[PDB]
Amino acid sequence: NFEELNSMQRYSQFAVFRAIPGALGSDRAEIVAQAQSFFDGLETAGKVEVRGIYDLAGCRAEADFMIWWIAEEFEEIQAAFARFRRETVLGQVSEVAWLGNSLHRPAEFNRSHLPSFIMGEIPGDWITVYPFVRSYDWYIMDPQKRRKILAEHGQAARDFPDVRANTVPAFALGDYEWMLAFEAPRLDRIVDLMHKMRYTEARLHVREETPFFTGRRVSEVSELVNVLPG
Amino acid sequence: ELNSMQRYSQFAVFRAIPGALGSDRAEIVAQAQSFFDGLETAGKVEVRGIYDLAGCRAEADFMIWWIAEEFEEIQAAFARFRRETVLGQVSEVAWLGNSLHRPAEFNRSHLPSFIMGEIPGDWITVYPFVRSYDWYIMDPQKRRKILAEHGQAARDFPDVRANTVPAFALGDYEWMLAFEAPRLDRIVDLMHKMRYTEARLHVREETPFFTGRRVSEVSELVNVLPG
Amino acid sequence: NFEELNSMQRYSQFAVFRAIPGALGSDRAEIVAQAQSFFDGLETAGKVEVRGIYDLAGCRAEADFMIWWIAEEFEEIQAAFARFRRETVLGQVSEVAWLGNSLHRPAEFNRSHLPSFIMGEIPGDWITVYPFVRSYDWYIMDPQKRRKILAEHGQAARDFPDVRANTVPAFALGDYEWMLAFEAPRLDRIVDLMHKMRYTEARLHVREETPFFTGRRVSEVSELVNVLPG
Amino acid sequence: NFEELNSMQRYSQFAVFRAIPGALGSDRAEIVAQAQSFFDGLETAGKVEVRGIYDLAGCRAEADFMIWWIAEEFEEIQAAFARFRRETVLGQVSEVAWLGNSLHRPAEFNRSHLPSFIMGEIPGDWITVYPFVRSYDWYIMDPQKRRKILAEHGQAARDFPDVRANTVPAFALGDYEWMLAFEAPRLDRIVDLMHKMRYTEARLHVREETPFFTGRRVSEVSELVNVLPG
Amino acid sequence: NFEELNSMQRYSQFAVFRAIPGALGSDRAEIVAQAQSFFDGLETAGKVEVRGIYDLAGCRAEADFMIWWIAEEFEEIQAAFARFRRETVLGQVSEVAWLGNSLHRPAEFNRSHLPSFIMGEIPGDWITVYPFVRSYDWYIMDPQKRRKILAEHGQAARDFPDVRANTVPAFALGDYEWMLAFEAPRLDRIVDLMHKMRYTEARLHVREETPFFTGRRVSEVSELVNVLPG
Numbered sequence A, C, D, E: 001n002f003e004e005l006n007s008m009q010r011y012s013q014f015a016v017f018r019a020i021p022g023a024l025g026s027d028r029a030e031i032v033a034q035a036q037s038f039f040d041g042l043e044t045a046g047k048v049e050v051r052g053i054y055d056l057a058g059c060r061a062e063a064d065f066m067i068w069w070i071a072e073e074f075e076e077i078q079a080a081f082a083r084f085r086r087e088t089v090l091g092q093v094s095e096v097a098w099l100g101n102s103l104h105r106p107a108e109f110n111r112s113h114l115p116s117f118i119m120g121e122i123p124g125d126w127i128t129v130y131p132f133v134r135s136y137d138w139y140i141m142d143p144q145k146r147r148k149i150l151a152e153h154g155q156a157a158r159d160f161p162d163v164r165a166n167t168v169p170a171f172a173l174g175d176y177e178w179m180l181a182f183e184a185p186r187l188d189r190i191v192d193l194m195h196k197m198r199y200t201e202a203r204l205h206v207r208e209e210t211p212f213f214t215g216r217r218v219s220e221v222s223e224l225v226n227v228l229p230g
Numbered sequence B: 001e002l003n004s005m006q007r008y009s010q011f012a013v014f015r016a017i018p019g020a021l022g023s024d025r026a027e028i029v030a031q032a033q034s035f036f037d038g039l040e041t042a043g044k045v046e047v048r049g050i051y052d053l054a055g056c057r058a059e060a061d062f063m064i065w066w067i068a069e070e071f072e073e074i075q076a077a078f079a080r081f082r083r084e085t086v087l088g089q090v091s092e093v094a095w096l097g098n099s100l101h102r103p104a105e106f107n108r109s110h111l112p113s114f115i116m117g118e119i120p121g122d123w124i125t126v127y128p129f130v131r132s133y134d135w136y137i138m139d140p141q142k143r144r145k146i147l148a149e150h151g152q153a154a155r156d157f158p159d160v161r162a163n164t165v166p167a168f169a170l171g172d173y174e175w176m177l178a179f180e181a182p183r184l185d186r187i188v189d190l191m192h193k194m195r196y197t198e199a200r201l202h203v204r205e206e207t208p209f210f211t212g213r214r215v216s217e218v219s220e221l222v223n224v225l226p227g
């Protein structure tokens, strides 16, 4: 129920990796098998929830893929992250490019606004993830003005019920105030959402929102491993 | 009327690794041409040009502009270029400029030169764009008037073809721009003249720029490189 | 005791390191032995006090661990820092990511505001460290007004007495004005403090506050070295 | 009026290079000879004119030397630049640090303002080169107001007839709007000119003007190559 | 007023280097003797005056030591800087991190304000060096208002006569407008001067003032060399 989801403690991490040319090679059948064994086991221990593994090929220089994983305790993401890097070839041959950490919290004025992953909704086939930093004046602004700006913001999104939002505090978990993730069945709906949301007063209260990471949720880690540069 | 076309457009900018190509490039070239010839036959990814960027900027050397109906088709081609060709193996990705063609806000005959199927220019400049935060909540007929005046400022440059394409959430930018022309100086002069527009008061970012010359085949580009 | 505490000379440095991929390897026993013998040697010399060694796993690309050490004279930190880099393999196989240097001073208006490390408090199990730079107008502002803004800033932290603050001048010891460290028993307390502190007039007088370094205090250097990426 | 000189087509490129420590060694006589041959070859083909080679030792980190060369067609500079890198050991043992490209055009108002290199003046013994970006409002501003401002700007340079300006459009040849190069017999004259030009209304209409490259024109390649780190 | 010291021509460079890990090793006595011979050779040549060599250990990532040297002609510094890098093993195993160049000039209003090094003062045991860039409106402000702001700025330092100032033009000698160095018997007085100088109206007319380089003047090259990482 809706207090329970608001009260829930869940850290969420987007871990973006870059491939190291030369490191992976071209014989990957066992690398694939080992990495799926690693995640299947994660799934079985029941502490870290891998919401998706995303192929970011062609999104940006210096990034190749992303793991989205979630846990009640940050220490459990730290452990999974450390093990991935140490106990799988995939993690050994990849560089950490960027880490987006966040912690679920009740929204300020609308307690029915909850991240897709907290709602337990099926993850979308396509995602864009990016951090966010608000104006300096945003939180100390008169609350009723912020409230109406956020209301208008939400109404501007109503044309996109198929795009699921995740707006999550990120204070002191890195350099940002929020971790944003939008999930959708087609990437053009994510592009068009971002374009439409420019038409809102809330854009007057924005300081940072890059880097973006956009890509395709793989059905299984084979699809990712097999595309990476060797 | 309504040109249907959904198209994604990517500018993939690569940096040559000094000392990686060396002097025996003929197998590298032949392998690279076979990759590109193979893309043409599959018929999903159209390569509008390969560009020599030599001398434009440090840390960039060449650029691939290819276009497809689904972004996953460009991901596969881009991944395949880097994975299965030595040319892709001995280069570094410097920058990726991604976009998705959409209709213009006000004037529905404003269409990118590649969507129109027009001949690619001998010379190209490519760069990203981010408007000021106040731009899209501006009164709509004001923004319409500004964009129309901005368009008029280019009438002396019919030989420069424009490509202004949404890039929201495909990277760090809002628009992907490419101007194609038969001579580089027409591009320099167009950008200079377009500064004399009210639209310039509503800009936040427009770098990095990539400017260079369209080559006829891979051989022409690869023989230029420092390797 | 507040006058002696306010008049004391103490430099504080946060030395943030990253591990060089491929440098540590599997045989790490001499490295740990040599490492703790370095830190034991520091404690017996009695000059440089290690408040904590912290594992920053999961926090950000390009940083893996942090040392927090304190000394009456900066040249003693210089000597300890250089010795770590020069005479330990752990320091030899690590890259310096960032240094946050500071010198304790009395606060401007409230002289009972003192860093936890100066108060001799037990360090917290979790930490976040970040530099701070005020707006150009902050110091030349009317003192009554800056004083009232700072008192409201302090009151906004009223529900986080378990989060211990260290706000320490950093002028001319790097690119910053202040070095901040917040110490707590659980990470979520740190995140929520930062979130609530956004609702303050002080936020209209801020220029820079990144990068952030967040992680967990380890009980000894053994626990750190065996967690690091290989 | 200067109608022919205003109408000529000339691209101008500043190619800045960084020496790779350890790459040259100390047996440089043949590296020099090969480099001299390459510049000999460019004179002979008559398409690319080298106005100067500059020793930038001590100006800034990560640059060591610069070539200023000029051609009617950009592709002639492209070919010669690429050939320097690909077909001489000096270019092979150097990294490109930064490129500043430009294309001469008539001035907006004072058509007697023409680059030193376009006028055919002897190149100065000392040079400073930097790119330039005007404020967003500069070109859409009322022409009468921009004309007044540029008139005051030219007048502020009245005491420096010995410092020769090259103010050359750079739109779409890079990240900048103008390429600036100031040539003089003495470096102090350039420092003093730059200082004096801060006293102009035009400074209220500036957005970017770094990096700077300042250095000493050499007589021949041997003078530069013998300076470089081995 | 101080006409001859105000009239004289001196270029001043701060040359900051970072050690290259792995390069120096543990065999250093002959590296030191050679470097001392190179510095002896400079003093006997009588053109380049080394005011100090500074241990920067622990100040910031990617910097380790600094040379401060001074000469009537900038090509003399260029030659010494290049000879250091090319012909001493210490120069060869070091990377240039940052260069801060400047040219002495008379102050705008107070001709009794002169750099410590121009006045022939013994160098301080501790230094902080940093570049500076004023606001775009600073130089075109009414001169009587800028004069008053600078006089109040000077008065704010009245309590720190022990911290000696060098405020030197840097236009066209890099990316900045001024090169600042503050030298003192004690580091803590430098920190406190910087803090106190925030309480000035001049602070409303600042654009840039980083990177900072802070450290201790060594008596002998051996003192520096023996602390660097191997």
Ligand code: FEC
Residues within 6 Å of the ligand: A107, A108, A109, A110, A113, A114, A132, A134, A150, A151, A153, A154, A155, A157, A158, A160, A163, A165, A167, A178, A180, A182, A193, A194, A197, A198, A202, A203, A206
């Ligand atoms: C996209 C996008 C961005 C980033 C780009 C931009 O700046 O526009 C974006 C930015 C943010 C940011 C920060 C916050 C954090 C709160 C703050 O104080 O900023 C943030 C927070 C909220 N958003 Fe937001 N958003 N957002 C959607 C998409 C985007 N949103 C869609 C879609 C919906 C609608 C679907 C849903 O509610 O789940 C939606 C609604 C809300 C609500 C609920 C509003 C209401 O009361 O109606 C809250 C709270």
Ligand code: FEC
Residues within 6 Å of the ligand: B104, B105, B106, B107, B110, B111, B129, B131, B147, B148, B150, B151, B152, B154, B155, B157, B160, B161, B162, B164, B175, B177, B179, B190, B191, B194, B195, B197, B199, B200, B203
């Ligand atoms: C160059 C250049 C830039 C970037 C530099 C600058 O800011 O000046 C530049 C920037 C943009 C940007 C963003 C947009 C996207 C819409 C927005 O809301 O920004 C953007 C959009 C439009 N542009 Fe634009 N431009 N632009 C041309 C060149 C440049 N344009 C030339 C040439 C023509 C002439 C027509 C053609 O040949 O296609 C032209 C016309 C249009 C029209 C059609 C307007 C009309 O006539 O009603 C639309 C829509």
Ligand code: FEC
Residues within 6 Å of the ligand: C107, C108, C109, C110, C113, C114, C132, C134, C150, C151, C153, C154, C155, C157, C160, C163, C164, C165, C167, C178, C180, C182, C193, C194, C197, C198, C202, C203, C206
């Ligand atoms: C968190 C955080 C930041 C950075 C983020 C932000 O800007 O909100 C933050 C920023 C700063 C900065 C700079 C300064 C330095 C003085 C200045 O002129 O900025 C700075 C200085 C002070 N803080 Fe501060 N803080 N701060 C706390 C947490 C944060 N603080 C908590 C908790 C408490 C309460 C507990 C305690 O005093 O120990 C607290 C109180 C004070 C007091 C005492 C106030 C009083 O008289 O009531 C002074 C002085």
Ligand code: FEC
Residues within 6 Å of the ligand: D107, D108, D109, D110, D113, D114, D132, D134, D150, D151, D153, D154, D155, D157, D160, D163, D164, D165, D167, D178, D180, D182, D193, D194, D197, D198, D200, D202, D203, D206
């Ligand atoms: C130095 C310096 C800078 C960069 C730093 C700053 O912004 O102060 C500097 C910046 C620029 C820039 C961009 C432009 C390009 C036009 C624009 O629209 O900005 C630019 C353009 C002009 N400048 Fe300029 N300058 N500048 C000189 C030095 C500097 N100038 C000296 C010397 C002379 C005088 C000698 C000569 O005519 O050749 C001089 C004169 C002119 C004239 C002719 C004006 C006149 O005399 O009526 C034009 C046009």
Ligand code: FEC
Residues within 6 Å of the ligand: E107, E108, E109, E110, E113, E114, E132, E134, E150, E151, E153, E154, E155, E157, E158, E160, E163, E165, E167, E178, E180, E182, E193, E194, E197, E198, E200, E202, E203, E206
């Ligand atoms: C520290 C510090 C900074 C940088 C931080 C800040 O912005 O406060 C700092 C910044 C600058 C900068 C640029 C300039 C260059 C001129 C300009 O137009 O900015 C610059 C120039 C001057 N400073 Fe300055 N300073 N400064 C001192 C310390 C600092 N100063 C101390 C100490 C004294 C006093 C001792 C002395 O005269 O040498 C002192 C005084 C002067 C005078 C003499 C003023 C007078 O009484 O008429 C001039 C001229």
